[PDB]
Paper text:
RedE resembles the canonical IRED fold with an N-terminal NADPH-binding Rossmann domain and a C-terminal helical bundle mediating homodimerization. Here, we present crystal structures of RedE, including apo, NADP+-bound and two ternary complexes with AFA and NADP(H). These crystal structures reveal an unexpected secondary indolocarbazole binding site adjoined to the primary active site, and site-directed mutagenesis shows both are critical for catalysis.
Comparison of the apo and binary structures show that R33 moves out of the adenine binding area in order to stack against the purine ring while forming a salt bridge to the nearby 2ʹ-phosphate. Superposing open and closed conformation protomers onto RedE shows that RedE resembles an exaggerated open conformation, with all atom RMSD values on average 0.3 Å lower for open conformations as to closed conformations. The C-terminal domain (residues 193–288) is a five-membered helical bundle where the latter four α-helices (α9-12) wrap around the interdomain helix of its dimer partner (αʹ8) forming an extensive 4020 Å2 interface (27% of total monomer surface area) between both N- and C-terminal domains as calculated by PISA software. The N-terminal end of α6 is associated with an iodide ion which is in turn stabilized by Rʹ254.
Numbering used by the authors:
A (entry chain D): 3 to 34, 45 to 290
B (entry chain A): -1 to 289
The structure:
């Protein structure tokens, strides 16, 4: 399959190599076995699928706006990182000039491209995703978020916050396990061996609590917010004894405490969405 | 019927009665006791033997599983049975402190009982299900000799030889759970909010999130040797990048009215690491800034 990569930076060059490794006829172009052309006009003309990874959405428009007429009948997969509004604006512009627009985000570094274990998230034209999915598989596992092009930007930000939340609880537990004391002086590798098994149950919690959020009904069942707050105060006590100062226990008891004061102690953790949202 | 291994459960609260049922369902000759009568339920009809005294329950099995309200109650029940427990295996799944676990273990060693201190990483309805964890620490002889029976409750993991480890592990794993779930709630509120690419349901985001947690699990496994080595190479995701992308999350959350305190925590923690000159280092370098 013919595919054009616009932008051969660290990530861009990784994407072009993934297409070549997967047996695609690849044309490349950079602002600074692949067939490199000297102009973006030539690159766009060489393929019906044009993948874009530029530094900013401003760079995307500076390169693509002069090519407004050349893009009719083509598919534009824009993996550039940017805001939800810029993804929507580029989607509308592409729709104006007759191009199928898929906005995407790469959920790994340049060295993760080509490996099918890393995710790339796309949102926008469904005909583009379905028609291009086999080619996009060269870069990693493709997921279709839906029809709104701006979804990929929001998802990346929301998934990074989930990652940092996980990693901050992990680092807190690592220091907790490493501190001197009875049952302490455990290495981070030993703790993480158990932690990664435990993450299967944490994933079950998230799967259990998402319908709670959507329904506005948060049955506490066997793990009420009373018990969360109860055990969070033990974590804060243990952390103060073992010298672990991460700010997490203060965030958690204050959040649950506000929900308890509101009278929702008999609810599940998902009720706490009402206390971080507007 | 019930010709499997003989096991006693002390304590018939919701969790203890769940443990007894799981032993029965696996076919074990199960003797049960509770500090107050009438809390056996359908256990005796399911094949268990309820006895009136803890001394009688202890003498009925070479494996004694303990699940009471507190370690105070543990000590009150076990203290009079010092000689009765000599030569037996005591598996104490009561929730408590590392010191109480250690006090109980040292008492057990004093009187000739093999002691495993454990924690159950689920609720009573999770006992006997799939992939739910029970963590044990203490006597390796007890773990290896009792493992086949303990599998009736859930997936057992041997944490090591220090009996107090299980208590510390439970507290550390809960913090990891709350950190994950608070970042999840943050993403839920971020995704559901108005705006381009928004108004996404929590269920839709979570299906994507549960795929993403495989990569997040790789980050933890990658960073754990960093902490143990004291060497935090940033590679292609440095603390500089973390901090810069955290500011986008902070501004995006501010726009969409998501107020979790997570973004301020992350930028503050990474900010001190960069000010100290470790911006090129990995996320694992931050362990020195909470230690
Ligand atoms: Cl670039
Ligand atoms: Cl009790």
């Amino acid at each position: 399959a013919k595919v054009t990569v616009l932008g051969l930076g660290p990530m861009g060059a990784a994407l072009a190599g993934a297409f070549l490794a997967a047996g695609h006829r690849t044309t490349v172009w950079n602002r600074t076995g692949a067939t490199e052309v000297a102009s973006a006009a030539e690159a766009v003309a060489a393929s019906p699928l044009v993948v874009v990874c530029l530094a900013t959405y401003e760079a995307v428009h500076e390169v693509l706006d002069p090519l407004a007429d050349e893009l009719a009948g083509r598919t534009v997969v824009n993996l550039t990182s940017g805001s939800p509004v810029h993804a929507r604006e580029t989607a509308n512009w592409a729709q104006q000039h007759g191009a199928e627009y898929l906005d995407g985000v790469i959920m790994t570094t340049p060295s993760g491209i080509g490996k099918p274990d890393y995710l790339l998230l796309y949102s926008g034209s469904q005909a583009a995703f379905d028609g291009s999915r086999g080619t996009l598989c060269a870069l990693g596992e493709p997921m279709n978020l839906g029809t709104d092009a701006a979804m990929a930007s929001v998802y990346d930000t929301a998934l990074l916050g989930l990652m940092w939340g996980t990693l901050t609880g992990w680092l807190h537990g690592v220091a907790l396990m490493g501190a001197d004391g009875p049952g302490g002086n455990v290495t981070a590798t030993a703790f993480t061996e158990v932690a990664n098994r435990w993450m299967k149950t944490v994933g079950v919690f998230m799967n259990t609590y998402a319908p709670h959020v959507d329904a506005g009904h948060y049955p506490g069942d066997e793990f009420t917010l009373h018990l969360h707050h109860r055990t969070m105060n033990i974590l804060a006590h243990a952390s103060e004894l073992r010298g672990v100062v991460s700010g997490l226990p203060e965030l958690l008891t204050e959040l649950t405490g506000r929900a308890i004061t509101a009278g929702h102690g008999n609810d599940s953790y998902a009720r706490l969405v009402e206390f971080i949202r507007k």
